[PDB]
Amino acid sequence: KVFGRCELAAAMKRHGLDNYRGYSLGNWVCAAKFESNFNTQATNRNTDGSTDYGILQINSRWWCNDGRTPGSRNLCNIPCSALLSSDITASVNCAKKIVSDGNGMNAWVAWRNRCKGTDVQAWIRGCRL
Length: 129
Ligand SMILES: [Cl-]
Ligand SMILES: [Cl-]
Ligand SMILES: [Rb+]
What we know:
3 strands, binds chloride ion, Glyco_hydro_22_CS, bacteriolytic enzyme
């Protein structure tokens, strides 16, 4: 599923991500924009043999099981395919674990490089939320 911007903002709020670990909703929308362009089905291989999945490009080396990533830990206890669903619950639940792991949203390099410090409220501006 390809979300609209305000649509995704609303879905993320509905699943308790607004201000989770102190990160405002616009941070999460911005991260999703640059990780997946709001496409739940996005997948991308990493140089190391792992793959990133879904709306927040969650990585099969630590977080989900895809059966092809030696050493995976599956800390979200989910198949990586669950992170591709039109329903964002599994991706939200797992992102909550990732952002709690110690480095906050720096776990998403694209958030650090493209969102951090910017006017992230722009991502929710105009939205009926
Ligand atoms: Cl915001
Ligand atoms: Cl933090
Ligand atoms: Rb596990």
